[PDB]
Structure 1
């Protein structure tokens, strides 16, 4: 399935190259620009543990990139995305909720999978 495909063919986009955040591009986006730190980003997404599933396609999910507003894997991964791109991210716990988790929904040491569509980003 999609998480296995990410494992096998996904690019390690971590600085440390510890396979903490693996990405595959599922739909190529437009042009070359990708967001900078501070940019306001607009996405649609859904995600799941590697059993819990959550989906945000009415209002976009909005955040400012690279400011610690989301889990580290998203500050890393969304930064790499072009407008219009859909990507899969497989995420080890160090780049998500770690040992504390986020109970009850997210257990300790959870791996997370997300499908993310970057709709737009603005300065």
Structure 2
């Protein structure tokens, strides 16, 4: 399924080239511009664990998740991955635990040492 495909066929978008964050562009976005550090970004997402369980979705909340890019307000894989996206893009992102919640996990939904899968849609970005 989609997690296996990004695992086996995704692009390594880490600067270290350690394959800790893998990406496939699923829906091509607009033009060439990507957000800059500090921009307010608006995203919809769904996340799954490697046991197949859906652990969260912003779609189910009827409002986007909003954060300031490149500030550590999200797991590392998201700062890295969202920075590569165009407006309107949908991607799949595979996040090894060193770019996610590590050995600690996040109680109650994320176990220790968890590889995470996301589908992410970049709705908009703006400077403040």
TM-score, normalised by the number of residues in structure 2 = 0.93
Please tell me whether the aligned partners of residues 46 and 54 of structure 2 are also in contact (alpha carbons under 8 angstroms): no
- The whole-number CA distance in structure 1 between the counterparts of 2:105 and 2:14 is 21
In the other structure, the counterpart of 1:86 is: 90
Structure 1 runs (4+) greater than 6 angstroms displaced:
none
* Aligned-pair CA distance for 1:103: 1.8
Q: Deviations over 1:24-53 (max 9, x none)?
A: 000000000001110110011001111342
How far apart in 1 are the matches of 2:41 and 2:89?
A: 13
For the pair 1:120 / 2:91, whether they are aligned, the reply is no
The unaligned stretches of length 5 or more in structure 2 are none
Aligned mates of 2:82, 2:6 — CA distance in 1: 16
Q: State the SS of the aligned residue for 1:110.
A: coil
Residue 59 of structure 1: how far off its partner (Å): 1.2
Unmatched 5+ residue regions in structure 1?
A: none
Which residue in 2 is equivalent to 1:48? Answer: 48
Q: Distance in 1 between matches of 2:7 and 2:73?
A: 26
Counterpart contact for 1:36–1:79, Cα < 8 Å: yes
Q: Residues of 2 paired with 1:101 and 1:12: CA distance?
A: 23
Paired with 2:24 and 2:32, the residues of 1 have a C-alpha distance of 17
Query: 1:32 aligned to 2:32?
Result: yes
| Counterpart-to-counterpart distance in 2, 1:93 and 1:100 | 9
CA RMSD of aligned residues (A): 1.0
| TM-score, structure 1 normalization | 0.97
How many angstroms does 1:11 deviate by? 0.4
